[PDB]
Amino acid sequence: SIKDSIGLRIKTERECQQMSREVLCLDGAELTVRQLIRIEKGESLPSLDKLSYIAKRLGKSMADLLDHDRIEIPDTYYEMKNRLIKFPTYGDKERVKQKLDLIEDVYNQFFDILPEEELLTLDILENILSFTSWEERPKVEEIYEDLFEQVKRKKKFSTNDLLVIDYYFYHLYGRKQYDKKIFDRIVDRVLKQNIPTDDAYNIALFNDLMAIAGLKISLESFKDFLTVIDKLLAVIEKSQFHSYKPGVYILEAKYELIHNGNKKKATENYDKAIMFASVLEDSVLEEKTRAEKAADGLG
C-alpha cells in the first residue's frame, strides 16, 4: 500500500543516517515514537504536519520521501468533514443517528487516504455521540494519548485539536478526582483561543466550552466560571448560534444556585434561557428548559 511504501522510505532513510527513533522524534511535540513506529510499519499515513517534520529531521524535501506516492486529501473530504462538524444534535436522538451516519459515510469514502489525526477525529465524534466507553477502544486510546500530549504544548488549537480536547473532557465525565494541573492548563488555553469566522471551528470550540462549564460545576472548580460563560456567549455572538443560548443560561443558573445559593439570580438566568428558547422554530428546547427550571425548584 501507499502507507507501506512511504513508511519504508522513511524507515530506510532514518536507518541510513543511523538515527534512532528517539533522536528523530526529539521532545515528541511534533512526532512521538509510537506515531513514527505506526508510520514505518505501514499502519498509518503521515499527515502533512508530521511528514513535514520528518523530512526536516532527515534533511530531505517531502517530495523525496514520497517518491511518486501522495498524502494529499481531496477537497470533498474537507467539505463533508465541515458539514459533519457543523451539524448540531441538541441531544435529539434522530439527529444523533443522522450525524453517526454522516461519520460512517465519510469514513467509508476516505479512510484509506486519511492520516492518523483525521481518523482519530472520526473515532472521537463517533465515541462521544454514541456514549462508547473510552476504555472499550484501547487502539483509539493509544493514538489519542500521544496527540493529547502534543496538544498540551500548543498555544493555538486547530479544529482537530479542539476535538482531541473534547475527548479529554469526555474522560473526566462523572469523575471526582482529576489531574488538576492538566485541567487548568487546558481550560486556560481554551479560554484564550481567538474566535474566527468559521462555524465548524466555533462549534467545536463551543462544545469544549460547554464541557468545561459542566465540569467546573461537577469538579467544583468554580474559578473563572463566569469567564467560561462569557466566552460561550462570545462564540454564539460571532456565529449567530441562537439555538445554543438556552444551554448557556441554564449553566449560569445552576452556578448561581449551587455556588452562590442565589435563587433570584438563578431564576433570572433560567428565564433568559426560556426566552431565548421561545423564539426558536420548534419548542422542544423551550419545553426542556422550562422542565429543568422546575426540577431545580424555581417557579
Residue 122 lies in a domain: yes
Residue whose cell numbers read 507501506: 4
Q: Are residue 56 and residue 140 in the same domain, yes or no?
A: no
Q: Are residue 42 and residue 124 in the same domain, yes or no?
A: no
Q: Half-sphere exposure of residue 43, counting CA atoms within 13 Å on the CB side?
A: 10
Angle at alpha carbon of residue 287, lines to 243 and 231, rounded to 5°:
35
Which residues form the domain of 187? 111-240
Cell output for 133 = 466507553
Q: Please report which residue ranges of 192-299 form alpha helices under DSSP H.
A: 199-218, 225-239, 245-260, 263-278, 284-295
Residue 103 lies in a domain: no
For residues 245 and 276, what is the distance between their CA atoms, to the nearest angstrom?
A: 6
Q: Are residue 44 and residue 153 in the same domain, yes or no?
A: no
| Three-state SS letters, 187-217 | HHHHHCCCCCCCHHHHHHHHHHHHHHHHHHH
Of the three residues 218, 240, 262, the one that is the final residue of a domain is 240
Q: Are residue 172 and residue 230 in the same domain, yes or no?
A: yes
Q: Are residue 131 and residue 189 in the same domain, yes or no?
A: yes
What total of structural domains would you count in the chain? Answer: 2
Handedness of CA 183, 129, 42, 138 (dihedral sign): positive
For residues 45 and 117, what is the distance between their CA atoms, to the nearest angstrom?
A: 9
Q: Are residue 192 and residue 126 in the same domain, yes or no?
A: yes
Q: Are residue 128 and residue 203 in the same domain, yes or no?
A: yes
The DSSP letter of residue 220 is T
Q: Are residue 232 and residue 148 in the same domain, yes or no?
A: yes
Q: Are residue 231 and residue 125 in the same domain, yes or no?
A: yes
Residue 96 lies in a domain: no
For residues 132 and 146, what is the distance between their CA atoms, to the nearest angstrom?
A: 20
Technique used: X-ray
3-state helix, strand, coil in the chain (%, to 5): 75, 0, 25
Of the three residues 240, 264, 285, the one that is the final residue of a domain is 240
Q: What is the CATH number of the domain that holds 21?
A: 1.10.260.40
For residues 135 and 144, what is the distance between their CA atoms, to the nearest angstrom?
A: 12
Angle at alpha carbon of residue 40, lines to 37 and 41, rounded to 5°:
85
Exposed/middle/buried for residue 68 (C-beta within 10 Å: 0-12, 13-18, 19+): exposed
| Spatial CA neighbour of 161 closest among 205, 110, 206 | 205
For residues 162 and 159, what is the distance between their CA atoms, to the nearest angstrom?
A: 5
